[PDB]
Amino acid sequence: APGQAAVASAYQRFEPRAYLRNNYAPPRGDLCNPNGVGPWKLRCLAQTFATGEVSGRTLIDIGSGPTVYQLLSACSHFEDITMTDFLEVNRQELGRWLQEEPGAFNWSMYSQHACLIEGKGECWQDKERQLRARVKRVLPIDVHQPQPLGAGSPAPLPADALVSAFCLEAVSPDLASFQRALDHITTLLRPGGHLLLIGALEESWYLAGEARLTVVPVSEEEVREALVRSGYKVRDLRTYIMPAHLQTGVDDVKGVFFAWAQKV
Ligand SMILES: C[S@@+](CC[C@H](N)C(=O)[O-])C[C@H]1O[C@@H](n2cnc3c(N)ncnc32)[C@H](O)[C@@H]1O
């Protein structure tokens, strides 16, 4: 309770535009360099889905924040998608892009790169069209509660698959809390279901405007073990080491991990 209400307090200052700018605009957001983290992440999301292994009807994105890139390759495999976030402002920022409102963040370069990578000959507008169509709702959530979505959420539970990028470690004061939060969201997944977990490796802080957030520094092994401890079978685990040119003043992240896990 103490460690959670403290994080919750820091997030009250979280500025979406500042977050988007620090991470999804160049240099980290430059998709032209094949060696950048942007191309690497999109590639690993596309290859995972191209296997045909991850499919079903409903999907939940845990801690969406103001981003949708994590769902570009996923959207053509799930007709009902639920996006979520703890903050009102992020859910509003998402709405601005989903409803094509004014001031929405421009994700077009990412959509185009996902199309380029997938190689199905799809134009980026159709991709965004399909994502917007399949995202049925944007709900509040708290991975710290035993029932993250709450009592009677509109979300079709359990889900056939889950996606979570940079949420758990960024809202957990320590490894133990990270483990619990993972246990918590795992209850939202159907047995045999899939979890695509993405996050920061050995990171301890990051900025988002006037907000300065703490992060729990986790390692690939710690993540692997935590996944096992939560009833998962790790189908794939990859690490991307942050090169010097992508190490800016916005945080102290050392690498990024990708975990494809199956609830057994
Ligand atoms: C660094 S962001 C990750 C956003 C996005 N998934 C991405 O890939 O960039 C962390 C997100 O977790 C949200 N969050 C904060 N406290 C949370 C909590 N207790 N439960 C769930 N999400 C929370 C924040 O509002 C924020 O959108």
Ligand SMILES: O=S(=O)(c1ccc2c(c1)CN[C@@H](CF)C2)N1CCSCC1
């Ligand atoms: O690896 S990123 O640079 C990235 C993307 C998001 C974040 C971080 C790093 C590190 N701090 C996280 C907050 F804890 C947020 N990349 C941004 C371009 S698209 C793939 C993800």
